[PDB]
Amino acid sequence: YDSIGGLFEDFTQSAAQRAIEVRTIFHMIGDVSGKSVLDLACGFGFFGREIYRRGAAKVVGVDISEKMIELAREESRKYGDPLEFHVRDVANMEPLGQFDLVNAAWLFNYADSVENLRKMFKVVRASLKPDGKLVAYTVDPDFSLAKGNFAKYGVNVLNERAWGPGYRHDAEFVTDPPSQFSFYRWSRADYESAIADAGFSHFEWQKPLLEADDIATHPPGFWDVFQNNCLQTGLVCKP
Amino acid sequence: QRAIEVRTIFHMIGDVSGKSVLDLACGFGFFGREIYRRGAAKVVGVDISEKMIELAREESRKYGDPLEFHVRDVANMEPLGQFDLVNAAWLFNYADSVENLRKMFKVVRASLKPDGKLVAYTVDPDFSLAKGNFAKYGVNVLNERAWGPGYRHDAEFVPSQFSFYRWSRADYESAIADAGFSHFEWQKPLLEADDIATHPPGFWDVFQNNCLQTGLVCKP
Amino acid sequence: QRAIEVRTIFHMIGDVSGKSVLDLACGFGFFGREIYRRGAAKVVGVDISEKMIELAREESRKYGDPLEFHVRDVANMEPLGQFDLVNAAWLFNYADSVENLRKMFKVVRASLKPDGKLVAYTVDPDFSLAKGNFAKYGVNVLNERAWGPGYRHDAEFVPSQFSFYRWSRADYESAIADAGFSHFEWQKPLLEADDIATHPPGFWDVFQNNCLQTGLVCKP
Amino acid sequence: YDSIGGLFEDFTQSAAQRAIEVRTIFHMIGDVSGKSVLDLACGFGFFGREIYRRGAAKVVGVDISEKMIELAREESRKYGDPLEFHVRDVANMEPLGQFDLVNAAWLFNYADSVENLRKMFKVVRASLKPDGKLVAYTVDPDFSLAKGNFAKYGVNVLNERAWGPGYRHDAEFVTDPPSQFSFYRWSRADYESAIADAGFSHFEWQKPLLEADDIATHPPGFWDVFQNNCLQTGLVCKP
Ligand SMILES: Nc1ncnc2c1ncn2[C@@H]1O[C@H](CSCC[C@H](N)C(=O)O)[C@@H](O)[C@H]1O
Ligand SMILES: Nc1ncnc2c1ncn2[C@@H]1O[C@H](CSCC[C@H](N)C(=O)O)[C@@H](O)[C@H]1O
Ligand SMILES: Nc1ncnc2c1ncn2[C@@H]1O[C@H](CSCC[C@H](N)C(=O)O)[C@@H](O)[C@H]1O
Ligand SMILES: Nc1ncnc2c1ncn2[C@@H]1O[C@H](CSCC[C@H](N)C(=O)O)[C@@H](O)[C@H]1O
C-alpha cells in the first residue's frame, strides 16, 4: 500500500460499499466509551480515528506500510487527535499491550498463507483483555467471481485462482487512476480453525448491514450482486 | 441525494407493519410505495396533479403493488376516512397562504384515527438564504421574497424548477394546534456520525447551520 | 541407522553449493539443515505439522543456521516460487491416494526452475511384506493391506509408530510424467562394498532382495 | 595376538573407527583389478580377502601369529577363496616375491624399535615391483594421549610413556571382554627416514577419510577427538 496511499481515501469517499462497511463495523463495535482500542491494518487511521471521536479512551493503530503510517500520523497531526501509530507486521508483531477492543478492518485478507492467518489470530488474542473482543471485516469465504464482479460497489476484482487451500484475487479500487492490489480468500473452515486454535471460544459471522433505506435510494436491483455474492463479511470473536 | 430525507422520514414513521397509510402530495408515489414495501397493510396516495397520479399508477403496475391513488387538492379534499398514519413529504411548503396551511392541517387531522400520527417533511422555518445556499445538497435556492407573514422561494433541483413557501414556526404551530393536534415535535434531519465520517471535512457544515429541510411529527 | 539413506540422498543431490533448496516434509529439518551445511545458498523447509515446524525452528536456533520454515500441506501448498533443488525425504509415501500422489508431484514441478531437479526418498513399489520384514534395518513393517490400487502399511521405528502408502511404480511414473517432468530415475539405496565387508555375512541379504526404500530423481 | 584371535573381528564389526579405516585404505589402494597383492600383518585376512573380492589376481597374507594365520586359513577354507597365508616375522621375513601392491594395515606400529621399523620398510621395498606401491595404516605420530582417549572409537589407550626415541602405548580393544595389546608410536621423522633409506622416493601421509555423512549420522561433536587427536593415519609409498 506504499503505492496506493491517499488513493485509498478517495476510494472510501466514493465506493458504494463503504457506507455499508462503516455502518456494519460500528454496529459490531457498539459503545466505545472509555475503552482502549487497537486498530490493526489501520491504513491512514480511519476507523481508529473515528472510534476515538465516538468516545474511546485510547487508540493505537498498526500498519505494515510506512507510507500509510506517515499519512495516519499526518491526519492526527492535522486534526489534533492523540492516536499513536506503529509500523509493524501484525503476523509477526512485537507485543503491544492488551486492549478492550481490537478492530481489524481488512487485515485478514492480507494473510498470504493459512499459517499467517493463524499467526494473526494468535496475535489478536494476545492483544486482548479477558473480557475484550475482536471486531473484524474481511473477505466472505463464499464470494465467487463468476457470480458477479464487485466493481460497481468500488472493488474491481480482476481474477481468481487457487492459492494452496484458498484463493488469490488480484484487484483494483475504482479510483483515478485505479490502484492495484492483491488479497486472499481463505475458507470458512480455515478461519474457524484459526479462531478456535487462537483461544477464541466465541465467534459469529456478521452479514453486512444493507438497509431498506439503501435499497430505496438506489436503482432497482443495484444491490442484487451485493446480496447474492457479497465480497465482504463482518466477524466478531471473544475469548 | 435523498438518503438523509428518506432515513429521517422512516425514523419518524417507525414500524408501519399492518397500518393503513395515506400518502399526501404523493407525486409518483415514492414514499407510499416504500411504506407498503416495509409492511403497511394498505396505502392510498393523493396528489393534486392528474399527470403525477397517472405516473404513480404506472409505477404500481411496473412493480405490482396494491397502492390506490386519487387526484385531490389536500386543501380542499374530498374526505377519505381515518388512517393510522398520514405521510406528507413536501406537502405543506406548497401552501401559498397561512389560511391554506391551516386548511391542510385540519384535513390531515380529519384523516387520522384518534391514536394515529402525521409524519411530515417540509421547509425549516429558520432557513435563510443569506446563511448559505443548499446547492451542495441538491437544491439550489434562487431567491427569497417576502410573502405576507412568510417567504416565497424559487428553487431548482440539481434538473427542474419549482417554488415553495416558508411559513414561520409560530404559524405552523398555530395551524397544528388549531387543527386539533395535542402534540407535535420538530425533527432535525437525522445526520449521523457515519455521514460525517464518510464525507470530506466540513461537507455538512451548511446542512447543519442553515438546513433547508425539517421533519415534523404531530399526534391527535 | 540412516547411514545408507543419508549417503544415497546426498549422492543424488550432488554438489549443492550456492543452490536454493526446498526441503519438503522436512520434519525437524534434518536434510535441509545438512544441505545448508554442505554449501546451499538458501534452504526453506515445509511440513504439514506445526509441531514439527516449531521443533525445526528450535533446532535452527540451537545451531545458528538461516533456514526458514513454513507449515504447509504439500498436496495443497501455497506457492513458494522456483528452487534449484527440491528434496523430499519421506514425502510421497504419505500421499493417501493416487490423486494426492499426483497433486504432490505437480506442486514439486511448480516449485522447480526449468534446470532444477527433485531428489526424493520413498517406499520402493516392489517391497512385499511376505519377502522379508525390515526390522533388522530399523523399520518393523507390521502389516500390509490393499488400498485401492496400492497398499497401506502400519509400521514402527525401532521407537514410534506410523503408517504409509505403497503406490505402484506405474502410478508413480504416471504422476511424474503428468506433472511435467521430462526425465526420472529410480536409485536403489547405495549399499557399498565397505558396508558388506564390515557386517556379518548375509546381513544385507533382505535389504537387497526386498528393500523397503528407494531413491528417485526427477528433472523437468 | 595369539590371545586375541576372534576378538579382533568383534572389534572390526563394532568400533566406530573401523568404517573410516576401511574406507581410507581402499581409497589409497584404488583399482586392484588384475594386481598381485601382499597383505602384511594380515590378521585373519580381512583386507587381503576383500582385496581379492574386489578383483585382485593373487593375494598372499603374512602374519607373525600362528593363531591368526589359522583363523585366516579357516575363513578362506570357509568362504572358498584362493588366499595363501604364511607365518612370518615381517621384520625378518624370508623373501616371498615381488608384488604390485603391498598392503600393511597395522604393521608398523608393532615395530618395537626404530631399527625394526627400518627393517620392515626395507622388506616392503624388496617385496615390490618397480611400479608398485605400499599402502599402510599406522599410528599417527602426532597422537597425544592427553588430548583425548580413543575408547569411544574402539581403542582404549591405557597409557603413554617414552620408549627410546618414540612412545609405547598399552591398550585394549573395546570388546567383550576387552583384549589387551601394546603398540609403538614412532616419530614422523623416524618414519620418513625409514622410508627414504629403504629406497622409496615418493611418500605421502593420508588423513583418515572422515566424511560429511559420518558427521551427519552421529551426535554433535562425536568426531571431535577423532579430528583433533587422531590415533590413525594412512601412508602411501612408491619406489
Ligand atoms: N500483515 C499486515 N500487518 C499490518 N497491516 C497490513 C498487513 N498487510 C496489509 N496491511 C495493511 O492493511 C491495509 C488494508 S486497507 C484497510 C485500511 C483501514 N483499515 C480502513 O479500512 O480504512 C493497508 O493499509 C495495508 O498496508
Ligand atoms: N394542495 C395540494 N394537494 C395535493 N398535492 C399537492 C398540492 N400541492 C402540491 N402538491 C403535490 O406535491 C408534490 C410535491 S413533490 C413531493 C412528491 C413526493 N411526496 C416525494 O417526496 O417524492 C407534487 O407532486 C405536487 O403536485
Ligand atoms: N502432505 C504433507 N505435506 C507436508 N508434510 C507432510 C505431509 N504429509 C506428511 N508430512 C510430514 O512428512 C514427515 C515424514 S518424516 C520425514 C522427515 C524428514 N524429511 C526426515 O527425513 O528426517 C513428517 O514430519 C510429516 O509431518
Ligand atoms: N612383526 C610382525 N610381522 C607380521 N605380523 C605382525 C608383526 N607384529 C604384529 N603382527 C600382526 O599384526 C596384526 C595387527 S591387527 C591388524 C590385522 C589386519 N591387518 C586388519 O587390519 O584387519 C596382528 O594380527 C599381529 O599378529
> Which domain CATH number covers B124?
3.40.50.150
Chains near D with 3+ CB pairs less than 8 A apart are C
CA distance A112 to A115: 8
Strands C83-89 and C20-24: parallel
Grid cell, residue B167, equals 411559513
Peptide bond into A220 cis (omega under 30): no
Cβ of A19 within 8 Å of Cβ of B198? The answer is yes
Contacts 24+ apart (CB under 8 A), A68-73: A68/A1, A68/A2, A68/A5, A68/A8, A68/A42, A68/A43, A68/A44, A71/A5, A71/A6, A71/A43, A71/A44, A71/A45, A72/A42, A72/A43, A72/A44, A72/A45
Closest CA to C213 of C195, C194, C187: C187
End-to-end CA distance of chain A: 31
Grid cell, residue C158, equals 525401532
Place of cell 497401506: C152
CA distance A117 to A112: 8
Is residue A228 within 8 angstroms of chain B, CB to CB?
no
From the CB of C59, is ligand 3 less than 6 Å away? Answer: no
* Under 8 Å between Cβ of C93 and C168: no
Instruction: Please give the number of the atom of ligand 1 that sits closest to the Cα of A62.
Output: 4
Q: In the 8-state DSSP scheme, what is residue D206? A: E
Cβ of C194 within 8 Å of Cβ of D19? The answer is yes
Compute the nearest-CA separation of C179 from chain D (Å). Answer: 32
| Contact between chain D and chain B (3 or more Cβ pairs less than 8 Å apart) | no
From the CB of C32, is ligand 3 less than 6 Å away? Answer: no
What Å resolution does this PDB entry report? 1.6
Rg value, chain C, Cα:
17
Grid cell, residue B84, equals 393510522
CA atoms within 13 A on the CB side of C85: 30
**Residue D40 burial (10 A CB sphere; 0-12, 13-18, 19+):** buried
Helix (H) or strand (E) holding C11: helix C3-13
* Under 8 Å between Cβ of A232 and A154: no
Rg value, chain D, Cα:
17
* Under 8 Å between Cβ of C36 and C67: yes
Place of cell 391514536: B115
Q: By CA distance, what is A115's nearest residue in C?
A: C71
- Sequential DSSP letters for A30-93: ---TT-EEEEET-TTTHHHHHHHHTT-SEEEEEES-HHHHHHHHHHHHHHT---EEEE--GGGP
Q: Give the angle B133-B136-B138 at the CA atoms, nearest 5°.
A: 95
Separation of A194 CA from ligand 3 center, angstroms? 22
SS3 of residue C74 by DSSP: helix
| Contact between chain B and chain A (3 or more Cβ pairs less than 8 Å apart) | yes
Amino acid at D136: A
The total number of structural domains that make up chain D? 1
Q: With the C-alpha atoms ordered A5, A7, A8, A9, is the resulting torsion angle positive or negative? A: positive
Compute the nearest-CA separation of D12 from chain C (Å). Answer: 7
**Residue C135 burial (10 A CB sphere; 0-12, 13-18, 19+):** middle
Q: Give the angle B7-B9-B12 at the CA atoms, nearest 5°.
A: 110
Cβ of D212 within 8 Å of Cβ of C3? The answer is no
* Under 8 Å between Cβ of D152 and D225: yes
Compute the nearest-CA separation of C155 from chain D (Å). Answer: 22
* Under 8 Å between Cβ of A97 and A128: no
- Interface A–B counts its CB contacts (< 8 A) at 33
Contacts 24+ apart (CB under 8 A), A212-217: A212/B10, A212/B34, A212/B37, A212/B38, A213/B3, A213/B6, A213/B7, A213/B10, A214/A19, A214/A20, A216/B6, A216/B34, A216/B37, A217/B2, A217/B3, A217/B6
Is residue A13 within 8 angstroms of chain B, CB to CB?
yes
Strands C83-89 and C112-123: parallel
Please state, as a whole number, how many other Cβ atoms lie within 10 Å of the Cβ of residue C200: 9
Domain that holds residue A41: 1-239
Chains near B with 3+ CB pairs less than 8 A apart are A
Helix (H) or strand (E) holding C109: helix C98-110
CA distance A22 to A38: 17
Rg value, chain A, Cα:
17
Cβ of D22 within 8 Å of Cβ of C200? The answer is no
Q: By CA distance, what is D215's nearest residue in C?
A: C34
Rg value, chain B, Cα:
17
- Sequential DSSP letters for B6-64: HHHHHHHH---TT-EEEEET-TTTHHHHHHHHTT-SEEEEEES-HHHHHHHHHHHHHHT
Q: Count the helices and strands in chain B (H runs, E runs).
A: 7, 11
CA distance A103 to A51: 10
* Under 8 Å between Cβ of C164 and C175: no
Peptide bond into C79 cis (omega under 30): no
Closest CA to A135 of A50, A70, A210: A50
Backbone φ and ψ for A46, nearest 5 degrees, come out as -50, -55
Give chain C positions within 8 Å (CB) of A165. 73, 76, 78
Q: Count the helices and strands in chain C (H runs, E runs).
A: 7, 11
- Sequential DSSP letters for D119-173: HHHHHHHHTEEEEEEEEEEEE-TT--GGG---GGGTEEE---EEETTEEEEEEEE
Grid cell, residue B30, equals 415514492
Question: For A165, which of C50, C70, C76 is closest by C-beta distance?
Answer: C76
Q: With b meaning 16 or more CB within 10 Å and e meaning fewer, what string describes C59-79? A: bbeeeeeebebbbbbbbbbbe
Please state, as a whole number, how many other Cβ atoms lie within 10 Å of the Cβ of residue A133: 21
Separation of B15 CA from ligand 2 center, angstroms? 24
Separation of B90 CA from ligand 2 center, angstroms? 6
From the CB of A63, is ligand 1 less than 6 Å away? Answer: yes
Compute the nearest-CA separation of C78 from chain A (Å). Answer: 4
* Under 8 Å between Cβ of B87 and B119: yes
Please state, as a whole number, how many other Cβ atoms lie within 10 Å of the Cβ of residue D80: 6
Closest CA to A20 of A167, A232, A221: A232
Give chain C positions within 8 Å (CB) of A115. 50, 70-72
Residues within 8 A of C (CB atoms), D 176-215 only:
212-213
Cβ of A164 within 8 Å of Cβ of C71? The answer is no
Closest CA to B212 of B131, B103, B146: B131
Backbone φ and ψ for D223, nearest 5 degrees, come out as -90, 10
Closest CA to C207 of C220, C219, C196: C196
From the CB of B86, is ligand 2 less than 6 Å away? Answer: no
* Under 8 Å between Cβ of C56 and C65: no
CA distance C134 to C155: 10
